[PDB]
Design a protein around this ligand. Sequence first.
Ligand code: 3EF
Ligand SMILES: *[C@@H]1O[C@H](CO[C@@H]2O[C@@H](C)[C@@H](O)[C@@H](O)[C@@H]2O)[C@@H](O[C@@H]2O[C@H](CO)[C@@H](O[C@@H]3O[C@H](CO)[C@@H](O)[C@H](O)[C@@H]3O)[C@H](O)[C@H]2NC(C)=O)[C@H](O)[C@H]1NC(C)=O
Ligand SMILES: *[C@@H]1O[C@H](CO)[C@@H](O[C@@H]2O[C@H](CO)[C@@H](O)[C@H](O)[C@H]2NC(C)=O)[C@H](O)[C@H]1NC(C)=O
Ligand SMILES: *[C@@H]1O[C@H](CO[C@@H]2O[C@@H](C)[C@@H](O)[C@@H](O)[C@@H]2O)[C@@H](O)[C@H](O)[C@H]1NC(C)=O
Ligand code: CL
Ligand code: ZN
Length: 608
Amino acid sequence: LDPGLQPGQFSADEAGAQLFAQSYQSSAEQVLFQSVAASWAHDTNITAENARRQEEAALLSQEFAEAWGQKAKELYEPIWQQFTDPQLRRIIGAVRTLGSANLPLAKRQQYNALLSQMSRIYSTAKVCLKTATCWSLDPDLTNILASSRSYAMLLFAWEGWHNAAGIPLKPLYEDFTALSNEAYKQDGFTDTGAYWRSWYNSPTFEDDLEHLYQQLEPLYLNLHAFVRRALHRRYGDRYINLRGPIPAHLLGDMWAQSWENIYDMVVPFPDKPNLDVTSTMLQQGWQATHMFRVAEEFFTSLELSPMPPEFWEGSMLEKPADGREVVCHASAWDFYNRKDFRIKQCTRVTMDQLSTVHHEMGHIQYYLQYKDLPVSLRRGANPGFHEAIGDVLALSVSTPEHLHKIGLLDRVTNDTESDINYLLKMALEKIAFLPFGYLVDQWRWGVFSGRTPPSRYNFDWWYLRTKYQGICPPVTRNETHFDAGAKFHVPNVTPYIRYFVSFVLQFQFHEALCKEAGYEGPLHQCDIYRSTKAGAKLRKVLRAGSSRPWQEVLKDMVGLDALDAQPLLKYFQLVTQWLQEQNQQNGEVLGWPEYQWHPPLPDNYPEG
Ligand SMILES: O=C(N[C@@H](Cc1ccccc1)P(=O)(O)C[C@@H](Cc1cc(-c2ccccc2)no1)C(=O)N[C@@H](Cc1ccc(O)cc1)C(=O)O)OCc1ccccc1
Ligand SMILES: *[C@@H]1O[C@H](CO[C@@H]2O[C@@H](C)[C@@H](O)[C@@H](O)[C@@H]2O)[C@@H](O[C@@H]2O[C@H](CO)[C@@H](O[C@@H]3O[C@H](CO)[C@@H](O)[C@H](O)[C@@H]3O)[C@H](O)[C@H]2NC(C)=O)[C@H](O)[C@H]1NC(C)=O
Ligand SMILES: *[C@@H]1O[C@H](CO)[C@@H](O[C@@H]2O[C@H](CO)[C@@H](O)[C@H](O)[C@H]2NC(C)=O)[C@H](O)[C@H]1NC(C)=O
Ligand SMILES: *[C@@H]1O[C@H](CO[C@@H]2O[C@@H](C)[C@@H](O)[C@@H](O)[C@@H]2O)[C@@H](O)[C@H](O)[C@H]1NC(C)=O
Ligand SMILES: [Cl-]
Ligand SMILES: [Zn+2]
């Protein structure tokens, strides 16, 4: 570690702790920068030489983390918990927590190599059929899951991906879990999952989540039964069991996590205007550039910041056309130099991708708003806040009235049929996700705690997938398969519960900004576009970073200091009642009592 980057001396008391924290943050900025740059270089251009450089940057970050961490523990371990200043308790508390820097050198290198190899496997995995031709997840497999209605073709894509990504990840993921736990246990956590959960500073986190899910589950059950009936009408009594789980490949998405793509099959009133504007975007010839500019302009309408020149010059907004492998999974980047901020997204011209652009731009806007704070306060109030920002705007954007304003929809009527179509569409996107958003880290917490050893990785994954989502694998799986590994966030070792928290929080935010905007109608028809008052209220959250506990930031914004499902329920209320009525009238069974049921294979599986 460079002498400039090493800690000096400070007194062993709170006042010395303050100078320590100030000096730590000054040096951390340069270390953060080299790490992010090295990651960018790799993720936008996956090569062996780029991975090596990224691993060297990771090692440097660990050197830094060890030097300052050991210093924190040397001076403040017996006393920091009694420090009068809570903001200081949080920083010294962080710095004493070394993570992977607790590992000896050989194991650090092992750890960094594992993260690189898992990332490469997920992002370069292919499904091969000409016999030489192979499909990538993004865009090829994504498009198949989205627009193919051929049971056998969907199965080929689903099975191919899960096998390609999952099988070779398993041995690496076991090794990562052991090293991760080894590292965090030295910091005093029972396991890595306990550390991840501690970011929410709620002694009652898991219980709070379970109570939230209990209120939401009836909405999911009804949507599920309605959707399963729509699928049965298309795929027949052979492939769909009206009392069983839905086969996992028929919902529009590789993970059955958003059901927006099957909207045309489920839309209650097909003779109203088509609220999926994808085909209009194609007909009008929208490109990635347009999508990003349209998203930016919503942000500036609120008097939030435009994207800076560095963003437009540095960002990767389409999958490269040259012979280059990249991580296509979308992300938003802060380089920690208060100047460079970028999105990396393999943008496709679709309505859901337009919402995705807003999502990533929400992350950037957060970065732009808190860029002048001490480096340790450059985070969301909690990670769920960071995930909610862009989704909040996308809720206004997808309203039929807003789509009309941006030329994507001829004026729609204020009628009850159109409302049900819209709310059903929004349910496929938002309600359908909830079980998945909840289950992923239940699975991962069980793995980190040891309740789920490698011998039960897949058994427990599918237990959870069936329990919450009411889906089943369309082919037989066993413990050689590692289906959790075929989801980005697992091999990329980044937490998922933030998204469940985001989905509740975004409706709380939406309700608060709509009220602030002076809007008076139904919550699902609110468009905060051009509301500088809504913008000012959002800006206060963004500029706070993590300087204040999230419960207080939420209280100031929303009037409540806790996550609350009521705003989401309020938003969906009309379609919640409608689906319940329809399911009853149709004589549906809610849930999937035939829990053991799996679909048969197509007659000519796997060729076609
Ligand atoms: O860039 C990220 N995180 C990206 C993931 C990531 C994490 C670590 C390392 C590399 C990458 P993402 O969540 O933007 C990447 C986004 C991509 C995305 C968004 C949408 C979308 C669809 C419709 C409407 C709105 C959004 N569909 O895919 C993501 O994964 N989302 C989750 C879950 C999800 C989130 C929102 C949502 O609306 C739907 C789903 C997923 O795809 O599984 O982190 C920024 C940040 C977060 C928290 C604190 C600080 C910084
Ligand atoms: C789409 O249509 C709805 C429904 O509008 C209502 O019912 C129709 C059948 C007609 O009779 C309409 O004339 C009638 O308003 C609209 O919802 C309504 O919006 C209005 C205007 O913002 C709301 O009026 C306000 O009500 C609050 C009370 O909460 C007062 O404080 C205000 O002074 C103001 O009068 C009205 O409450 C609201 N109705 C309901 C049931 O929520 C909706 O605005 C419209 N949407 C669009 C985008 O055009
Ligand atoms: C992808 O990364 C590689 C490095 O892995 C880059 O290749 C280097 O490019 C510079 C200048 O173009 C050369 O001086 C080096 O000799 C190259 N290194 C190697 C190992 O070949 C490459 O430029 C990157 N590609 C893109 C499009 O950015
Ligand atoms: C697990 O399954 C592997 C491959 O899947 C199998 O082959 C396909 C075509 C179907 O027939 C499916 O039912 C089978 O599961 C097997 O090759 C492998 O032997 C199995 N692993 C273990 C440990 O038994
Ligand atoms: Cl999280
Ligand atoms: Zn995100």
